[PDB]
Design an enzyme around this catalytic site. Structure first.
Site, PDB file in Angstrom:
ATOM      1  N   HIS A  41       0.807  -1.077  -0.038  1.00 43.27           N
ATOM      2  CA  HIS A  41      -0.053  -0.282   0.074  1.00 43.27           C
ATOM      3  C   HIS A  41       0.523   1.329   0.118  1.00 43.27           C
ATOM      4  O   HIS A  41       0.131   2.398  -0.061  1.00 43.27           O
ATOM      5  CB  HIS A  41      -1.302  -0.148   1.091  1.00 43.27           C
ATOM      6  CG  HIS A  41      -0.515   0.062   2.348  1.00 43.27           C
ATOM      7  ND1 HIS A  41      -0.563  -0.768   3.200  1.00 43.27           N
ATOM      8  CD2 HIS A  41      -0.351   1.476   3.009  1.00 43.27           C
ATOM      9  CE1 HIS A  41      -0.221  -0.399   4.575  1.00 43.27           C
ATOM     10  NE2 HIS A  41       0.116   0.945   4.352  1.00 43.27           N
ATOM     11  N   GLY A 143       2.015   6.286   9.963  1.00 40.35           N
ATOM     12  CA  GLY A 143       3.601   6.337   9.542  1.00 40.35           C
ATOM     13  C   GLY A 143       4.424   5.096  10.034  1.00 40.35           C
ATOM     14  O   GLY A 143       5.396   4.760   9.571  1.00 40.35           O
ATOM     15  N   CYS A 145       3.593   1.934   9.377  1.00 41.37           N
ATOM     16  CA  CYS A 145       3.117   0.943   8.503  1.00 41.37           C
ATOM     17  C   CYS A 145       4.383   0.421   7.924  1.00 41.37           C
ATOM     18  O   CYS A 145       5.249   1.243   7.671  1.00 41.37           O
ATOM     19  CB  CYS A 145       1.963   0.839   7.548  1.00 41.37           C
ATOM     20  SG  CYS A 145       2.114   2.543   6.684  1.00 41.37           S
TER      21      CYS A 145
HETATM   22  C1  LIG Z   1       0.567   3.396   7.019  1.00 42.87           C
HETATM   23  C2  LIG Z   1       0.401   3.500   8.916  1.00 42.87           C
HETATM   24  O1  LIG Z   1       0.991   4.106   9.326  1.00 42.87           O
HETATM   25  N1  LIG Z   1      -0.830   2.764   9.037  1.00 42.87           N
HETATM   26  C3  LIG Z   1      -0.790   2.230  10.488  1.00 42.87           C
HETATM   27  C4  LIG Z   1      -1.509   3.247  11.079  1.00 42.87           C
HETATM   28  C5  LIG Z   1      -1.557   2.732  12.727  1.00 42.87           C
HETATM   29  N2  LIG Z   1      -1.915   3.649  13.428  1.00 42.87           N
HETATM   30  O2  LIG Z   1      -1.536   1.541  12.978  1.00 42.87           O
HETATM   31  N3  LIG Z   1      -1.741   2.222   8.356  1.00 42.87           N
HETATM   32  C6  LIG Z   1      -2.936   2.911   7.902  1.00 42.87           C
HETATM   33  O3  LIG Z   1      -3.253   3.849   8.250  1.00 42.87           O
HETATM   34  C7  LIG Z   1      -3.606   1.837   6.729  1.00 42.87           C
HETATM   35  C8  LIG Z   1      -3.442   2.590   5.452  1.00 42.87           C
HETATM   36  C9  LIG Z   1      -3.812   1.585   4.233  1.00 42.87           C
HETATM   37  C10 LIG Z   1      -3.560   0.178   3.894  1.00 42.87           C
HETATM   38  C11 LIG Z   1      -4.157  -0.554   2.782  1.00 42.87           C
HETATM   39  C12 LIG Z   1      -4.965   0.008   1.977  1.00 42.87           C
HETATM   40  C13 LIG Z   1      -5.360   1.541   2.409  1.00 42.87           C
HETATM   41  C14 LIG Z   1      -4.796   2.119   3.275  1.00 42.87           C
HETATM   42  N4  LIG Z   1      -4.986   2.120   6.882  1.00 42.87           N
HETATM   43  C15 LIG Z   1      -5.508   1.936   8.345  1.00 42.87           C
HETATM   44  O4  LIG Z   1      -4.705   1.173   9.038  1.00 42.87           O
HETATM   45  C16 LIG Z   1      -7.032   2.164   8.516  1.00 42.87           C
HETATM   46  C17 LIG Z   1      -7.027   3.397   9.510  1.00 42.87           C
HETATM   47  C18 LIG Z   1      -8.479   3.861   9.773  1.00 42.87           C
HETATM   48  C19 LIG Z   1      -9.009   4.621   8.719  1.00 42.87           C
HETATM   49  C20 LIG Z   1      -8.120   4.891  11.102  1.00 42.87           C
HETATM   50  N5  LIG Z   1      -7.872   0.891   9.007  1.00 42.87           N
HETATM   51  C21 LIG Z   1      -8.910   0.435   8.619  1.00 42.87           C
HETATM   52  O5  LIG Z   1      -9.277   0.726   7.297  1.00 42.87           O
HETATM   53  O6  LIG Z   1      -9.435  -0.691   9.261  1.00 42.87           O
HETATM   54  C22 LIG Z   1      -9.798  -1.723   8.380  1.00 42.87           C
HETATM   55  C23 LIG Z   1      -9.854  -2.992   8.837  1.00 42.87           C
HETATM   56  C24 LIG Z   1      -8.818  -3.998   8.947  1.00 42.87           C
HETATM   57  C25 LIG Z   1      -8.820  -5.372   9.214  1.00 42.87           C
HETATM   58  C26 LIG Z   1     -10.086  -5.685  10.244  1.00 42.87           C
HETATM   59  C27 LIG Z   1     -11.174  -4.727  10.409  1.00 42.87           C
HETATM   60  C28 LIG Z   1     -10.833  -3.317   9.814  1.00 42.87           C
HETATM   61  C29 LIG Z   1       0.342   4.824   6.509  1.00 42.87           C
HETATM   62  O7  LIG Z   1      -1.032   5.260   6.822  1.00 42.87           O
HETATM   63  C30 LIG Z   1       0.185   5.022   5.187  1.00 42.87           C
HETATM   64  O8  LIG Z   1       1.547   5.318   4.509  1.00 42.87           O
HETATM   65  O9  LIG Z   1      -1.095   4.639   4.193  1.00 42.87           O
HETATM   66  C31 LIG Z   1      -0.318   4.233   2.718  1.00 42.87           C
HETATM   67  C32 LIG Z   1      -1.765   4.254   2.169  1.00 42.87           C
END
Ligand SMILES: *[C@@H](C(=O)N(CCC(N)=O)NC(=O)[C@H](Cc1ccccc1)NC(=O)[C@H](CC(C)C)NC(=O)OCc1ccccc1)[C@H](O)C(=O)OCC
Ligand SMILES: *[C@@H](C(=O)N(CCC(N)=O)NC(=O)[C@H](Cc1ccccc1)NC(=O)[C@H](CC(C)C)NC(=O)OCc1ccccc1)[C@H](O)C(=O)OCC
Lengths: 304, 300
Positions: A41, A143, A145
């Site tokens: 991603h 940030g 991830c």
């Molecule tokens: C990447 C980053 O730092 N993180 C970690 C955030 C954290 N506090 O752990 N990742 C993200 O925010 C995800 C980004 C993403 C990944 C793949 C496709 C599209 C987007 N997004 C999420 O984790 C997201 C955050 C919420 C909107 C607050 N969570 C969900 O969508 O929940 C879904 C779910 C998954 C599994 C089971 C149930 C529900 C950083 O944000 C980055 O660089 O993004 C690149 C796109």
């Protein structure tokens, strides 16, 4: 007396951490030999994340779309490819600090250290467990991830986790280092079914054993139970069912303390029903479930 | 949501850990530039841990009497002296992995990371706090003495703690990197104990402010208080009385969360007098006191 969550020293993993950039998205990558692994991603912009088609997004990219930075030094990408939910980016330089390592897929209830990073910069380390519902209870901000979880075994670093998402209950989902998700999750930002977490019964018993080794015995009793009778009660309280294979895993701790597994089960059974009535066990109220039998053995005998 | 004690990455400090042996004793030391610091009790023997006379023992010792090992490399000791409760061994090699560093004395309630070692080998890292009674609730086994505690500010390791002793309650006593004990402890196996401890109110409030940042917000109430009033209460719950300088420190989080310090105190006062009623804060039953206002800001 005195026992706490410890992480593995993180020196060996820190020398592997890089920053990967694609567009205006930056996250963390793992540089081993001449590959960087990172969440796929990184190739998503805002509009992509609701419903990304990754093979579509990836065909639109070149080696040159990826800027990888180690310290203050840019590494050149000379190949890229996708493996499940990961990208493997081939770089011109093979990492001089690459440790002995392997990739392993771990099981629910097992623990590992997490090096939390932002813009390829290591920022903190902590210890957590793979929960029975395949999430982890970490601590991560935007940030993070690409951060990785690992164990160290003698000289060798086993990588078992790479962080991808935060679910809306505050827990985290990610993949192994072949890019396969732990759990029924996908790397899209859409609501996903998680599954009620449960207590890791095998770890709670390991931890009761650790208490006995460190001198806390007040909770022991001269009852015993059947595996089945124990599970009747435990399951009422949202504990995982205890299998005979779990009982075999506790054999060593049992031998060392002289307390049979089913007799310890009888102690937990009373703890679950009556509580602690004011007391503590290793300074905790609350029964702790994020120490494995091996954690307890390592930390009560101090393996380095 | 999602909030945890975390340690600083231990890498910079792993590079400095060495094994010091004198006689039958092996413990840990810290190798910075051309000096190794380790607890002076390394020169004791089974017979005289009760009343060691360190000044005697240290003349009896030559450089020869100390063997220092970095990984598979013996370091030649070429000078030895004592600074308070530490030994300083001059070695023939400057540590090539020496980081930028400072020595600092930490204050009660402050947090640091510990790198737990055995035989100059890193075993694990965990985060703790200097208790009000000058002990730390650490996790140490025989052979850990000389393990050190630190903070990392940007790229500079601030070493704050080195480990010497376990007290009968399972808490640990140690010194700063000039060898001065925290607390009234001494490096002799002699009856001596941790006074009664208090809860670090300042940290608890930090933690509550974290809670109401990360979303947990149920404990906030329409109530107000006075420092004076609050403190009288705190002290009946074995909490450190809050001072004005403490309140001045909570200003950022108070500015950020939009909740007056004293308002938050009134929420604390209530939690003390009424319990949590089964619910949680940041996934904890019980109020947490080993997160400083600075830690909160960092991990938020
Ligand atoms: C990447 C980053 O730092 N993180 C970690 C955030 C954290 N506090 O752990 N990742 C993200 O925010 C995800 C980004 C993403 C990944 C793949 C496709 C599209 C987007 N997004 C999420 O984790 C997201 C955050 C919420 C909107 C607050 N969570 C969900 O969508 O929940 C879904 C779910 C998954 C599994 C089971 C149930 C529900 C950083 O944000 C980055 O660089 O993004 C690149 C796109
Ligand atoms: C080094 C070592 O690992 N430790 C710490 C172990 C731990 N779990 O924290 N260091 C010691 O054990 C101290 C050694 C020492 C210090 C000064 C002078 C002589 C020896 N001793 C203690 O920590 C000791 C407890 C021991 C476990 C017996 N604590 C006290 O002295 O508390 C005071 C007291 C109160 C009541 C009754 C008796 C004593 C390793 O042990 C080593 O290298 O020792 C070298 C001499």
């Amino acid at each position: 007396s005195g026992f706490r969550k410890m992480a593995f020293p993180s020196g060996k993993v820190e020398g592997c951490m890089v920053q990967v950039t694609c567009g205006t998205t930056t996250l963390n990558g793992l540089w081993l030999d001449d590959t960087v692994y990172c969440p796929r991603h990184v190739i998503c912009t805002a509009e992509d994340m609701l419903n990304p088609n990754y093979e579509d997004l990836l065909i639109r990219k070149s080696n040159h779309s990826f800027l990888v930075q180690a310290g203050n030094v840019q590494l050149r990408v000379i190949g890229h490819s996708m493996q499940n939910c990961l990208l493997r980016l081939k770089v011109d330089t093979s990492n001089p600090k690459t440790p002995k390592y392997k990739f392993v897929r771990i099981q629910p209830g097992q623990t590992f250290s997490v090096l939390a990073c932002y813009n390829g910069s290591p920022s903190g380390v902590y210890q957590c467990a793979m929960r029975p519902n395949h999430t982890i209870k970490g601590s991560f901000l935007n940030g993070s991830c690409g951060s990785v979880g690992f164990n160290i075994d003698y000289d060798c670093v086993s990588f078992c986790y790479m962080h991808h998402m935060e679910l809306p209950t505050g827990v985290h989902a990610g993949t192994d280092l072949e890019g396969k998700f732990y759990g029924p999750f996908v790397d899209r930002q859409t609501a996903q079914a998680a599954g009620t977490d449960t207590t890791i019964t095998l770890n709670v018993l390991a931890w009761l054993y650790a208490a006995v080794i460190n001198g806390d015995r007040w909770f022991l009793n001269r009852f015993t139970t059947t595996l089945n009778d124990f599970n009747l009660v435990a399951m009422k309280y949202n504990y995982e069912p205890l299998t005979q294979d779990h009982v075999d895993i506790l054999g060593p701790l049992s031998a060392q303390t002289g307390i049979a597994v089913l007799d310890m089960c009888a102690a937990l059974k009373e703890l679950l029903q009556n509580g602690m009535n004011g007391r503590t066990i290793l300074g905790s109220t609350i029964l702790e479930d994020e120490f494995t039998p091996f954690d307890v053995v390592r930390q009560c005998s101090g393996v380095t």
